Amino acid sequence: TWLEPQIKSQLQSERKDWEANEVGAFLKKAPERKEQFHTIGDFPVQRTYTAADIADTPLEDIGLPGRYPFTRGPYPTMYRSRTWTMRQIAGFGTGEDTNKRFKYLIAQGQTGISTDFDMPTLMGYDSDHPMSDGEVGREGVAIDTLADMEALLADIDLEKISVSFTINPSAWILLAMYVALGEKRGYDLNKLSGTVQADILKEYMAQKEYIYPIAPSVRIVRDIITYSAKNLKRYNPINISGYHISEAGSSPLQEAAFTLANLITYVNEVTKTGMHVDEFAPRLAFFFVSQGDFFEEVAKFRALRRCYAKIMKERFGARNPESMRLRFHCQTAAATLTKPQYMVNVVRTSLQALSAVLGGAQSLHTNGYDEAFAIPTEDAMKMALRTQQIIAEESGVADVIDPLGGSYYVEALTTEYEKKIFEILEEVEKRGGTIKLIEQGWFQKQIADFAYETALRKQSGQKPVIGVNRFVENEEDVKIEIHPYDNTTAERQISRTRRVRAERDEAKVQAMLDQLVAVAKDESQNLMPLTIELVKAGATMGDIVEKLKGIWGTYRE
């Protein structure tokens, strides 16, 4: 206890007085809009918060940044020493196309590379597969071969800038290509900073990018994790993600708790190999959204850091402090942005970027004002970077660590999130674990319920959406520059894939694929070394993916 009980009593007595005197008189003059107000994530909120409301939370649970339980930040110096990475997503056409956008984004002030891939690549298909028709380089960049990655990362010093890949069931193939590229370039692998999203549990739950059944797919994540721990010192093998859970329609509580449920499953799978938690936990990372409820999102980020620290220390027995410090990439909520009055998205994204900064994010993507129309233009991305640069350089928020620390409301909400998160994590365990609940569609049903209640709240006008159900305009003069699809992308991409297959040693590649099946047949062996040899030898993602479908099959809901 930090609050003197003689003062806690005074506070509680004084508020009860104020509720009947000042509050009672004003509610007569003009009542409040709602009998009970709630956050967007459905947590009930008080009219005001005092020190009495946080008296039950010990000051140790707040503490100091870069010190356990890291509520105030994973680093003790945060933005006074190093700003968050301004890392904007880029992805369309061929490697060359996205490489041009990387260069533009870097010239505009981005400090980290983020790459989004097309559907064939995300789904494990080569550009010429029948399932790929009309989808090559459309929603992101096309990667079939290591040759395409060379085009993608042309003139990019991989040892001097970090490179993120938004790749999931076929993440191991892209990581093998990255390693093969780094070797070809004569780089030190332990100097390569980067990330592959890789988190498959959230794919079954929310993003819907999967190739194989749950079990072999988790083993791949495990192989990515174990390989990176032993071979790539500065590499982040996963981003255990909440973003997609939120964007699929979840509440901030479902986002936070379901991501932590996935973390537990992963740690158990990796430690099962005999790898001690402290060999890999320091390098684990997360990915969260910065949604519309300004204070709730900050409370959620601080609660996640505290919950994560407690789980790693208490449940996993971690002894390295870095194993308990949560590091996360953040993206502003794309689901809050509108097609009508699109420039108003600049305001929405400003507030959401600020919540991420106040929340202590390590990396940030700000969405473009053109979010509800198409993949972004250069101008839209430029505006998203200026947004970050204004917060970083003009607002002053970067100079004081965890400035919201101590806030009666933020502290009470941080504590409410923590308890509600643990309560969910407990039910998941009681109900038989993550995998079983994913198989029962339990997570997905909860997400779907929130998504539907959100849709009904938008319809009734109970949830205000400016331009949609509030201040609606009949805009006839909508002028918007849209990023176009280059119709030569498929022809251009297949040409290279066909060439790579023609130029390669077919016999050696086919033999190496047969070796891969043997490595995959042994659950204890790592898939990474041979996939690195395969991509080098001229194997395509499709060659690798298809060969493994023969022993593992495919997943369907």
Binding site: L122, M123, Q459
Partner: protein, 131 residues
């Protein structure tokens, strides 16, 4: 006098399903018989289901930007099987001119992002009554 039989579909590599699951729940709750194709279906798989299941309406949710390739393929298969009288509707996200180009192909309704679920219920009952 049987309930309105709706097939809600997902075509191609598109894994966006938040909107389609919202529409599905909206129609089931409105008293309709709703069939969901599931993710990653081909236009031929989708057309076959619409016919085999003898649906009144085929609802395609698109967010992958493939509408101009998908819709001509769907109609080509529907014409082949004498199923041109099937009400084909679309939803999701696409440019205004894409919405226009698919209506010109034979799509009866295009109800995109922010369409309140009641408007979807109403349009379907309206399209079924018109025929």
């Amino acid at each position: 006098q049987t309930p309105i039989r709706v097939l809600l579909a997902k075509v191609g590599l598109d894994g966006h399903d938040r909107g389609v699951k919202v529409v599905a729940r909206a129609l089931r709750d409105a008293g309709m018989d709703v069939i969901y194709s599931g993710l990653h279906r081909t236009p031929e798989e989708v057309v076959n289901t619409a016919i085999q299941e003898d649906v009144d309406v085929l609802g395609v949710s698109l967010l992958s930007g493939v509408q101009l390739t998908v819709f001509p393929k769907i109609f080509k298969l529907l014409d082949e099987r004498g199923a041109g009288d099937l009400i084909v509707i679309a939803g999701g996200v696409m440019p205004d001119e894409d919405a226009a180009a698919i209506r010109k192909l034979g799509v009866r309704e295009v109800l995109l992002q922010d369409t309140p679920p009641q408007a979807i219920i109403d349009s379907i009952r309206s399209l079924v009554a018109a025929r």
